Amino acid sequence: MLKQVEIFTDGSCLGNPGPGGYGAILRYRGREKTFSAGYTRTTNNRMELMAAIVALEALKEHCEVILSTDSQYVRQAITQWIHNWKKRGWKTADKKPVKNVDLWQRLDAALGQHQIKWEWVKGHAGHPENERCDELARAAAMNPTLEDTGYQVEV
């Protein structure tokens, strides 16, 4: 039995927008859950954020999570932006809503219930669980069954 919740996420997209997917692996309680789905039209950044959201929301009590992703998009926002995004009320310098604000808020709500430790691996030097992730991310994109609502060529 693992003392720490462990999450592995990945996201993929064939275009901009194009069919995309995500694969997340959750090591919770004594089980190992596997999430995966593809969306008909979307972006790689929305697929990479979806990975984490869908995984953190499977957790039904306050945990100590360790998250592993090679996503630079998430890294950058967690490391240099998000802090600033709350204080300003989720707005850009030109007073418009940040890109993917719908998912950043959704994720901010999920990150909120837990003790979160981030692990930024390099796309080519991670665990096999990151590889199984990319793999699912890929397969998903090759067969979309859902629609990414909050997607906008826009805002």
UniProtKB/Swiss-Prot annotation:
Instruction: Give the protein's biological function.
Output: Endonuclease that specifically degrades the RNA of RNA-DNA hybrids. RNase H participates in DNA replication; it helps to specify the origin of genomic replication by suppressing initiation at origins other than the oriC locus; along with the 5'-3' exonuclease of pol1, it removes RNA primers from the Okazaki fragments of lagging strand synthesis; and it defines the origin of replication for ColE1-type plasmids by specific cleavage of an RNA preprimer. Involved in production of retron derived msDNA (a branched RNA linked by a 2',5'-phosphodiester bond to a single-stranded DNA).
For this record, an example GO cellular component is: cytoplasm
Subunit details: Monomer.
**Short name of one Pfam family:** RNase_H
Q: What does the record give as cofactor?
A: Mg(2+)
Gene3D superfamilies membership: Ribonuclease H-like superfamily/Ribonuclease H
Q: Which residues bind Mg(2+) 2?
A: D10, D134
- Cofactor binding remark: Binds 1 Mg(2+) ion per subunit in the absence of substrate. Requires millimolar levels of Mg(2+) for maximal activity. Has low activity at micromolar concentrations of Mn(2+) and is inhibited at higher Mn(2+) levels. Can bind a second metal ion at a regulatory site, or after substrate binding.
Q: What is the effect of changing N130A?
A: Reduces activity
Q: Which reaction does it catalyse?
A: Endonucleolytic cleavage to 5'-phosphomonoester
Q: What is the effect of changing D134 to H/N?
A: Slight decrease of activity
Localization per Swiss-Prot or TrEMBL: Cytoplasm
Which stretches make up the RNase H type-1 domain? Answer: 1-142
Protein name according to UniProt: Ribonuclease HI
* UniProt GO MF annotations: endonuclease activity; magnesium ion binding; nucleic acid binding; RNA-DNA hybrid ribonuclease activity
Gene it is expressed from: rnhA
**By its UniProt entry, which PANTHER family does this protein fall under?**
RIBONUCLEASE H1
- Per UniProt, Mg(2+) 1 binds at D10, E48, D70
Originating organism: Escherichia coli (strain K12)
Q: What class of enzyme is it?
A: hydrolase
Q: What EC identifiers does the entry list?
A: 3.1.26.4
Q: Which family does it belong to?
A: Belongs to the RNase H family.
Annotated GO biological process: DNA replication, removal of RNA primer
